[PDB]
Design a protein around this ligand. Structure first.
Ligand SMILES: Cc1cc2nc3c(=O)[nH]c(=O)nc-3n(C[C@H](O)[C@H](O)[C@H](O)COP(=O)(O)O)c2cc1C
Lengths: 143, 139
């Protein structure tokens, strides 16, 4: 990842965001040492050209992402197209991002609030993805 | 024969649930890099839960290098599963034959003696089924 290619990465980020929105639910894979872990995730938003996911700083999945920032996401839309997005995540501790998350995905307010001490937002510092279709060439992108 | 059912009950519950899911997600490691992709089939053979792959795929190679995996997926009722375990390859023709009858879409690509088709079963595992509202079991 290079900051001066941010114009290119932005287009890949927007495609990933769009596609993950089409999927609705998607699956986030982490490691706990040599044990893979996977669970459904369902909230994504953009801020300052970055793709964010949300979690809770008390959860195993969060602790896993801190201990090993490498993750992979996969999901499928109603047409049977699917994504694989490989990358690294960083926790963003800025209060303003938490506020924005709750406005972008207001259903989050059912569980989280800005000053609850548990709400976490994390973004992809880098990543590479492929969107696969039954018919047609793979679409590849970077963020 | 509750005692005897125990060999089967966790596996049967996982099988039933993953069939309800249709598509589920299989996570492996490639060293320190987690990997996940959609899977679309499951079958049982003599009390064990099987999945399919082919021996040229990265996912298969990853499962041989590190047998630890986790599966997750959601059914049509707002429930989801987390199934953690270890997998083993099974080279037997008889199991591959049953696979092709249990999952007939495979016949489109695979045959028992094609040198590529692979089936793997859970040697052990632990599952949890959750709802927006937890059932746990062991394979
Ligand atoms: C549809 C759906 C969407 C979800 N979205 C998220 C989410 O975006 N972030 C999150 O932290 N948990 C989300 N969850 C909850 C996690 O799957 C759950 O907390 C899981 O247990 C966390 O992983 P862990 O047990 O390894 O810590 C979602 C669950 C469902 C079923």
């Amino acid at each position: 990842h290079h900051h001066h290619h941010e114009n290119l990465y932005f287009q890949g980020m927007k495609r990933a965001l769009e596609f993950l929105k089409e999927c609705g639910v998607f699956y986030l894979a982490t490691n706990e040492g040599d044990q893979p872990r996977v669970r459904p995730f369902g909230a994504v938003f953009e801020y300052e050209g970055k793709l964010y996911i949300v979690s809770n700083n008390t959860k195993k999945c969060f602790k896993q992402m801190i201990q090993n920032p490498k993750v992979e996401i996969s999901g499928m839309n109603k047409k049977g197209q699917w994504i694989r997005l490989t990358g690294e995540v960083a926790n963003d501790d800025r209060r303003e991002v938490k506020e924005l998350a709750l406005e972008a995905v207001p259903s989050l307010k059912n569980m989280y609030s800005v000053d609850d001490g548990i709400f976490a937002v994390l973004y992809f510092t880098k990543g590479e993805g492929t969107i696969c279709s039954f018919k047609g060439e793979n679409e590849t992108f970077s963020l």
